[PDB]
């Protein structure tokens, strides 16, 4: 048993490019890329939460970590996508 | 010699009353100087539903 | 003179701890600060406790029965920057704007965090 | 009573619960809030979607139907915020963008 | 001409004392404990004797005396003692209570009262509509044990003003009260306020001043100075009005013919040199011979240079967009150059990025345009830009002078600030406005159908009263009359009332209740009722609150 993200990112590619094939090595690069991005974002958030003497990770410290890591227009588009996703998910009423 | 009589304004109330056949319909109009409530026979009500009139139309 | 005018008007209207305007007995109790947010909370929980005791009795005039209901008519939309009639709305930060020049100069190249303060005015943050 | 996952509650195609699992036993914090995996999942959504967009346009730019790592390399190195983010990582089987200095040309 | 504002001027004369000879131990005292001000005086007078803001502060001195009796009007003496003032009201309620005791001791001292075993006089007091039980019990406790008054009466200030303006005590009318922190519409039948149908909107003058502050700070983010609450308060008082029709006044407020009136302003080489000299002499001879033709040619050259520079600036702006088709064409050109000749080498050389060379070429084109303008001399406006009209009004603006760098304009806000009591959604409160609450009181209630008004509804419409301290805004009565004519049936007579000064009508209300009528004794609570019924006791009289349940 081993874990990969392959079906999800495959679906992401079929949403915008239906007639496009895939090399397995390309999944190896892109899986390493998404794991590396998750890696830096998560330890930046943990480092920031350890700074503020807090024991809890919420949306705001990863928001600040996204603002710290990503370039500015990617930062603003990423926080736009994240805020609309978390407000859609938070409307469970 | 003829006489022209005109009601116009926003519809605020459209309540038909029966006795499958509507006996009458009460329409309440509204303008900038006040409101007015009118009774109507079903013949005009058929023309009203011909025009697809809902609440809030002029 | 300037420094002593406040002293003169302070000692003119000074009342000691044995205040003559009080009663013979005082017995001053201890009270919490009890901010205005939590007063609504425990009044609401007292009302709910009384209601669930009485059920297992309608209220007449409470602090929550007097409060006005929301409107039935649709609310008008205004531009968040100028206060004029807001025709459009940006898809990124959900800010209503009036025309193209406001969008090009203010709404699109706006600093992060100011959009939430703009939405704070109509309570949409 | 049966309800589906949080990913379509947030409208995302990446797994929210798997990200929550990795954030839980990744020993980053002793307590993890509810809204953190949704936000992180949305960020990974947008990053993967943009990278796949640039790769798909690169593969269309070479008249092929498959994603070669050359397409990924040229899509990353051609664009400049992806240049700044991914400056220190070497793509496996990527190659080098063509550039000649102006003074090295046969100027005559 | 810009008008400058400042802090309000301070009172030089200290507040006076009531005489000791005028003390009557049996006369009552009317106290209006408002959120913004306090009104205290004896019953037998018509005008309240003491008016001061409901605030106090503590003063520290170097001599270590800790004199902290700067209460009410005493805070209007110095800028330092005024800025540290603190009111007992936090929101619509009273949170702390030692300062309330200090304020009541100050006003009892200034009322010329010499007590013995507490205050021997009954007390007239107002309270918030549908107040919480803790405020009532704690008010009972302080007023019955700390001061030991013989009698206590509770009521609502809007109902007190309605009793003032019809002292028969059995009339029927509609009361609209615009207060400091809330706005209430209370229906009155036969002199008794039907509190089961009264409504409250969480908006007042304080929220209006804070809304003006937030709006004006959003309009000018780089303002050099910081302005206090009182400056926003006085430009709210002086430059705000209710529009007759907001939905028409919005669409024409920023036009040029409207902004000029109702906008307020608040503060080898030698051969080349010989050839160049010959060309300059030929140009001078052409200017002296045909100046108009040379001027037209130089103007055409300047227009061509300006058009070329505009095309270059458009290309430079289009090259910055990543999602543009020019960026896609550049990516396709890069892919084709990777895919692959002197022409191909020239294309690879010319496909390089040159931002600094683009800036140098723009500078050279600007120099050429300046040369063409000089040849034309020798031989973008703010009218259509609505952002400049919103920011700096109908006048041109320069940023290099310090006089208009400290300058503020109020054009849209003058009608935007008082409009929130009619549309509360603009302030963030999900509540109906004043007019819709009046509509659903008069039309869908009290045995009245839409289109057929009952007799009680007609008597209510004929006796509409507007009160409260926030009725000072002009244009309120005409707007209320226009909307009331808007929703009512035709032929209905609408009569509205408004004081010359609607702040003091509650004091005249309890003065006329305690003085003119002996039916004040119907509402009086004594020692024995407090001792035998407890603090959770409510007298269901015609002017106060009611029992919470049924």
From Swiss-Prot, chain B:
Top-level taxon: Eukaryota
Residues of the signal peptide: none
Cell compartment(s), UniProt: Nucleus
Function in brief: DNA helicase which participates in several chromatin remodeling complexes, including the SWR1 and the INO80 complexes. The SWR1 complex mediates the ATP-dependent exchange of histone H2A for the H2A variant HZT1 leading to transcriptional regulation of selected genes by chromatin remodeling. The INO80 complex remodels chromatin by shifting nucleosomes. Its ability to induce transcription of some phosphate-responsive genes is modulated by inositol polyphosphates. The INO80 complex is involved in DNA repair by associating to 'Ser-129' phosphorylated H2A histones as a response to DNA damage.
Self-association state and partner proteins as the record states: Probably forms a homohexamer. Interacts with RVB2 and may form heterododecamers with RVB2. Component of the SWR1 chromatin remodeling complex composed of at least ACT1, ARP4, RVB1, RVB2, ARP6, YAF9, VPS71, VPS72, SWC3, SWC4, SWC5, SWC7 and SWR1, and perhaps BDF1. Component of the chromatin-remodeling INO80 complex, at least composed of ARP4, ARP5, ARP8, RVB1, RVB2, TAF14, NHP10, IES1, IES3, IES4, IES6, ACT1, IES2, IES5 and INO80. Component of the R2TP complex composed of at least RVB1, RVB2, TAH1 and PIH1. Interacts with SPT15/TBP and HSP90.
Miscellaneous field: Present with 11600 molecules/cell in log phase SD medium.
Family: Belongs to the RuvB family.
Record's protein name: RuvB-like protein 1
Natural source organism: Saccharomyces cerevisiae (strain ATCC 204508 / S288c) (Baker's yeast)
Full-length numbering of the shown residues: 134 to 199 of 463
UniProtKB/Swiss-Prot annotation, chain C:
GO biological process: one example: DNA repair
UniProt keyword annotations, A-Z: Nucleus, Transcription, Transcription regulation
Cell compartments where the protein resides: Nucleus
Main localization category: nucleus
Domain of life of the organism encoding this protein: Eukaryota
GO CC list: Ino80 complex; nucleus
Protein's UniProt keywords contain Nucleus: yes
KW Manganese (keyword) present: no
Subunit structure as annotated in this protein's UniProt entry: Component of the chromatin-remodeling INO80 complex, at least composed of ARP4, ARP5, ARP8, RVB1, RVB2, TAF14, NHP10, IES1, IES3, IES4, IES6, ACT1, IES2, IES5 and INO80.
Note: Present with 1720 molecules/cell in log phase SD medium.
Membership in a protein family: Belongs to the IES6 family.
Function: Probably involved in transcription regulation via its interaction with the INO80 complex, a chromatin remodeling complex. Also involved in the regulation of telomere length.
UniProt name for this protein: Chromatin-remodeling complex subunit IES6
Residues of the full protein shown: 28 to 162 of 166
From Swiss-Prot, chain E:
One Pfam family this sequence matches: Actin
Signal peptide, first to last residue: none
Gene Ontology BP term (one): DNA repair
GO cellular component, one term: cytoplasm
Matching Gene3D superfamilies: 3.30.420.40, Actin, Chain A, domain 4
Record localization: Nucleus
Transmembrane intervals: none
Keywords: Isopeptide bond, Nucleus, Phosphoprotein, Transcription, Transcription regulation, Ubl conjugation
Covalent link Glycyl lysine isopeptide (Lys-Gly) (interchain with G-Cter in ubiquitin), residues: 1
GO molecular function, one term: enzyme regulator activity
InterPro entries with a match to the protein in the record: Actin, ATPase_NBD
Modified residues (Phosphothreonine): 13
Family to which the UniProt record says this protein belongs: Belongs to the actin family.
Subunit (UniProt): Component of the chromatin-remodeling INO80 complex, at least composed of ARP4, ARP5, ARP8, RVB1, RVB2, TAF14, NHP10, IES1, IES3, IES4, IES6, ACT1, IES2, IES5 and INO80.
Misc remark: Present with 2170 molecules/cell in log phase SD medium.
Function: Probably involved in transcription regulation via its interaction with the INO80 complex, a chromatin remodeling complex.
Name under which the protein is recorded: Actin-related protein 5
């Amino acid at each position: 048993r081993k874990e990969t993200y392959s079906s999800y990112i495959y679906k992401v590619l079929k949403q915008t490019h239906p007639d496009t094939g895939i090399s397995q090595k390309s999944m190896s690069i892109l899986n390493s890329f998404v794991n590396d991005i998750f890696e830096r974002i998560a330890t930046e958030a943990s480092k920031l939460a350890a700074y503020n003497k807090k024991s809890t990770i919420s949306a705001r410290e990863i928001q600040t970590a996204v603002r710290l890591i990503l370039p500015g227009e990617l930062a603003k588009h990423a926080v736009s996508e994240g805020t609309r996703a978390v407000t859609k998910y938070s409307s469970s009423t | 010699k003829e006489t022209k009589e005109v009601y116009e304004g926003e519809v605020t109330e459209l309540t038909p009353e029966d006795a499958k056949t509507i006996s009458h319909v009460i329409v309440g109009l509204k303008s900038a100087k006040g409101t007015k409530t009118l009774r109507l026979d079903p013949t005009i009500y058929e023309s009203i539903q011909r025009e697809k009139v809902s609440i809030g139309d002029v | 003179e300037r420094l002593l005018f406040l002293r003169s008007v302070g000692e003119r209207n000074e009342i000691g701890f044995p205040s003559r305007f009080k009663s013979a007995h005082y017995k001053k109790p201890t009270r919490r600060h009890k901010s205005a947010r939590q007063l609504i909370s425990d009044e609401n929980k007292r009302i709910n406790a009384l209601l669930t005791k009485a059920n297992k009795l309608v209220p007449k005039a409470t602090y929550f029965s007097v409060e006005a209901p929301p409107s039935i008519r649709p609310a008008k939309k205004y531009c968040d920057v100028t206060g004029l009639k807001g025709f459009y709305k940006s898809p990124t930060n959900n800010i209503r704007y009036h025309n193209a020049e406001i969008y090009q100069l203010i709404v699109k190249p706006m600093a992060p965090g100011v959009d939430q303060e703009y939405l704070k005015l109509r309570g949409a943050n | 009573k049966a309800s589906q996952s949080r990913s379509a509650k947030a409208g995302l195609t990446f797994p929210v619960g798997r990200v929550h699992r990795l954030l839980r036993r990744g020993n980053y914090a002793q307590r993890i809030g509810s809204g953190a995996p949704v936000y992180l999942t949305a960020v990974l959504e947008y990053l993967a979607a943009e990278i796949l967009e640039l790769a798909g346009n690169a593969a269309r730019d070479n008249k092929k139907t498959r994603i070669i790592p050359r397409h990924l390399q040229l899509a990353i190195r051609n664009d400049d915020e992806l240049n700044k983010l991914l400056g220190n990582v070497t793509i496996a089987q990527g190659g080098v963008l063509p550039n000649i200095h102006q003074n090295l040309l046969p100027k005559k | 001409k810009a008008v400058v504002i400042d802090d309000p001027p301070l009172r030089q004369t200290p507040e006076p004392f009531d005489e000791q000879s005028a003390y009557n131990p049996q006369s009552p005292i009317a106290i209006d404990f408002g959120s913004s001000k306090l009104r205290a005086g004896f019953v037998n007078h018509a005008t309240p004797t003491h008016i001061f803001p409901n605030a106090l502060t503590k003063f520290r001195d170097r001599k270590l005396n800790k004199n902290f009796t700067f209460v009410g009007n005493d805070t209007l003496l110095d800028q330092a003692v005024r800025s540290q003032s603190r009111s007992p009201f936090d929101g619509p309620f009273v949170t702390n209570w030692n300062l309330t005791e200090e304020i009541l001791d100050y006003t009892f001292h200034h009322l010329g009262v010499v007590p013995d075993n507490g205050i021997p006089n009954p007390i007239l007091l107002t309270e918030r509509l549908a107040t919480v039980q803790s405020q009532r019990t704690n008010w009972y406790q302080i007023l019955f044990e700390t001061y030991n008054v013989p009698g206590v009466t509770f009521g609502i200030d809007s109902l007190f003003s309605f009793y003032n303006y019809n002292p028969s005590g059995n009339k029927t009318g509609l009361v609209i009260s615009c207060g400091h922190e809330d706005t209430n519409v209370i229906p009155v039948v036969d002199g008794a306020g039907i509190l089961t149908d009264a409504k409250r909107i969480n908006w007042g003058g304080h929220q209006a001043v804070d809304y003006l502050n937030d709006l004006m700070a959003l309009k000018y983010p780089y303002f050099p100075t910081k302005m206090s609450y009182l400056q926003y308060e006085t430009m709210y008082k002086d430059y705000c009005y209710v529009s007759r029709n907001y939905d028409e006044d919005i669409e024409k407020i920023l036009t040029l013919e409207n902004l000029d009136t109702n906008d307020v302003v608040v503060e080898e080489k030698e051969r080349v040199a010989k050839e160049e000299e010959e060309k300059k002499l030929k140009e001078q001879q052409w200017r002296e011979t045909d100046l108009n033709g040379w001027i037209k040619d130089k103007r055409l050259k300047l227009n061509k240079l300006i058009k070329r520079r505009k095309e270059k600036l458009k290309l430079r702006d289009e090259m910055k967009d990543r999602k543009s088709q020019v960026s896609q064409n550049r990516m396709k050109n890069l892919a084709s150059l990777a895919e692959d000749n002197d022409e191909d080498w020239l294309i690879y050389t010319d496909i390089t990025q040159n931002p600094e060379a683009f800036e140098e070429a723009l500078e050279y084109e600007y120099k050429d345009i300046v040369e063409l303008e000089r040849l034309l001399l020798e031989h973008y406006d703010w009218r259509n830009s609505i952002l400049h009209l919103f920011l700096r009004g109908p006048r041109p603006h320069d940023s290099e002078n310090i006089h208009e760098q400290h300058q503020m304009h109020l054009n849209v806000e003058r009608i935007r600030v008082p409009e929130v009591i009619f549309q509360p959604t603009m302030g963030g409160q999900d509540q109906a406005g004043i007019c819709e609450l009046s509509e659903t009181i008069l039309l869908k209630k009290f045995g009245s159908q839409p289109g057929k008004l009952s007799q009680t509804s007609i008597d209510m419409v004929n006796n509409v009263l507007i009160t409260g301290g926030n009725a000072k805004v002009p244009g309120l009565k005409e707007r209320i009359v226009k909307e009331f004519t808007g929703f009512l049936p035709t032929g209905t007579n609408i009569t509205v009332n408004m004081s010359s000064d609607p702040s003091l009508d509650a004091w005249k209300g309890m003065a006329a209740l305690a003085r003119n009528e002996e039916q004040y004794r119907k509402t009086v609570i004594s020692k024995k009722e407090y001792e035998e019924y407890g603090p959770e006791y409510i007298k269901e009289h015609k002017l106060g609150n009611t029992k919470y349940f049924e």
